[PDB]
Amino acid sequence: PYTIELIQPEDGEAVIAMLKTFFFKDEPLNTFLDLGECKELEKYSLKPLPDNCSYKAVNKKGEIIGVFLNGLMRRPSPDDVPEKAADSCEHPKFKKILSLMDHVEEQFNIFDVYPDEELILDGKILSVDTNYRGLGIAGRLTERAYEYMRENGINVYHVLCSSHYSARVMEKLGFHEVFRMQFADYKPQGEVVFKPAAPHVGIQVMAKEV
Ligand SMILES: CC(C)(COP(=O)(O)OP(=O)(O)OC[C@H]1O[C@@H](n2cnc3c(N)ncnc32)[C@H](O)[C@@H]1OP(=O)(O)O)[C@@H](O)C(=O)NCCC(=O)NCCS
Ligand SMILES: CC(=O)NCCc1ccc(O)c(O)c1
Structure with missing residues (x-):
């Protein structure tokens, strides 16, 4: 028995504590790199919260057992100056992850797929406590966002998945692939980074059109 609730500003520390226990250690790229202490990822995770569309799953004792942190993304302005997230990151391991994200965005712009859309919901951080996995919590977190989308006239939910394992979860929820890149083909300086x-x-x- 659990609830799905909007994440409030007072929840930041608890959200980070949960992510440090799970996501920081068990998202596949993080585990591959052994991310360790990473204040940059804490910062990254806290950033979308004030958009008021991030959700927590909370058990009957009041403990956070899952989160889906979402932020609004806006179509680049006609005079946009594209910036690499990796350029402002001092943590070498997290820099590799941000560089991968930058590379994906350089190759693929979600706003090209949906020329009429100005605002798209971006699912940034999805994590469920191990003891509560396989119960559909990811789905219930995801579907709570549809409510926000409806309330705000947002049609598209965009989610970068870091493994085929998690992409499959999103497929079950009615999302479809819009871009892919094999780790074996990601060679920014001529060599494989992630194995x-x-x-x-x-x-x-x-992506899902809701
Ligand atoms: C991806 C993740 C959020 C899924 O959350 P979830 O609430 O367990 O999602 P689901 O309940 O839909 O379970 C997904 C699949 O995990 C498998 N599963 C079943 N029981 C499980 C368990 N005890 N533990 C782990 N996985 C289990 C099943 O294949 C299941 O699919 P199915 O129920 O349709 O057969 C979770 O695995 C997670 O936190 N992973 C690590 C962080 C990560 O990679 N986040 C996503 C980055 S894009
Ligand atoms: C929907 C989701 O959780 N995508 C994960 C993307 C991601 C984010 C932060 C990381 O440190 C990382 O390795 C991978």
Whole structure:
């Protein structure tokens, strides 16, 4: 028995404590790199919260057992100056992750897929406590966002998935792939950076039109 609730500003520390226990250690790229202490990822995770569309799953004792942190993304302005997230990151391991994200955005712009959309919901951080996995919590977190989308006239939910394993979860929820890149093909300086286990395959950007 659990609730799905809007994450409030007072929840920041608890959200970070939960992510440090799970996501920081068990998201596939983080585990592959052994991310360790990473204040930059704490900062990254806290950033979308004031957009008021991030959700927590909370058990009957009041403990956070899952989160889906979402932020609004806006179509780049006609005079946009594209910036690399990796350029402002001092943590070498997290820099590799941000560089991968920058590379994906350089190759694929979600706003090209949906020329009429000005605002798209971006699912940034999805994590569920191990003891509560396989119960559909990811789905219930995701579907709470549909409510926000309806309330605000947002049609598209965009979610970068870091493994085929998590892309499959989004597929079950009615998302479809819009871009993919194998880890074996990600060679920004001529060499492979990420070599996690074979079943992960690579990143898949997933989207749903709600
Ligand atoms: C991805 C993640 C959020 C899924 O959350 P979830 O609430 O367990 O999602 P689901 O209940 O839909 O379970 C997904 C699948 O995990 C498998 N599963 C079943 N029981 C499980 C358990 N005890 N533990 C782990 N996985 C289990 C099943 O294949 C299940 O699919 P199915 O129920 O449709 O057969 C979770 O695995 C997680 O936190 N992973 C690590 C962080 C991460 O990679 N986040 C996503 C980055 S894009
Ligand atoms: C929807 C989601 O949780 N995508 C994960 C993307 C991501 C974010 C932060 C990381 O440190 C990382 O390795 C991967």
